Design a protein around this nucleic acid. Structure first.
Ligand SMILES: [Mg+2]
Ligand SMILES: [Mg+2]
Ligand SMILES: [Mg+2]
Length: 86
RNA sequence: GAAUCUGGUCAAACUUGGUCAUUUAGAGGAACUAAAAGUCGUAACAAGGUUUCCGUAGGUGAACCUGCGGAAGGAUCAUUA
């Protein structure tokens, strides 16, 4: 019950994808994605993987930055958000 | 014929405003250049993998994309009768 986990999916070379799993569905997700895009400039998209819920995918190694953003805006704790690293 | 004195006249200056010029602190904001082992793509150069440009309008994360009209600086100097 509500534990946000951010992970890298390793792609070709140094280019990667960052998946945000278990996002709270309180604020508008598309809007959030747009904001993220505006911020650090990474091509964001929303994926619904076999009812895990709503997964935000971003380009590169936006993990720490994402966490910071969450802290600033919607995320309250630092604790229920875990950042993996693969 | 001195002080003094009535009007002028030239007129420095002074009080409060306004104005033009040049400076000058300047919370913040938006730039461009330089250095070009950061990040996201790959827009352009080959038909650059949707031919490029241009005017213009809209849209976007970012190169940009998409209308409408145009230009080869195009990948065509080419289909008689
Ligand atoms: Mg290209
Ligand atoms: Mg092209
Ligand atoms: Mg020229």
């Amino acid at each position: 019950s509500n534990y946000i986990h951010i992970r890298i999916q390793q792609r070709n070379g140094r280019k990667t994808l960052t998946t945000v799993q278990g996002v709270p569905e309180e604020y508008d997700l598309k809007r959030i994605l747009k904001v993220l895009k505006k911020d650090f400039a990474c091509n964001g998209n929303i994926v619904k993987d076999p009812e895990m819920g709503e997964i935000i995918q971003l380009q590169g190694d936006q993990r720490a930055k994402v966490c910071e953003f969450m802290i600033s805006q919607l995320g309250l704790q630092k604790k229920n958000i875990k950042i993996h690293g693969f």
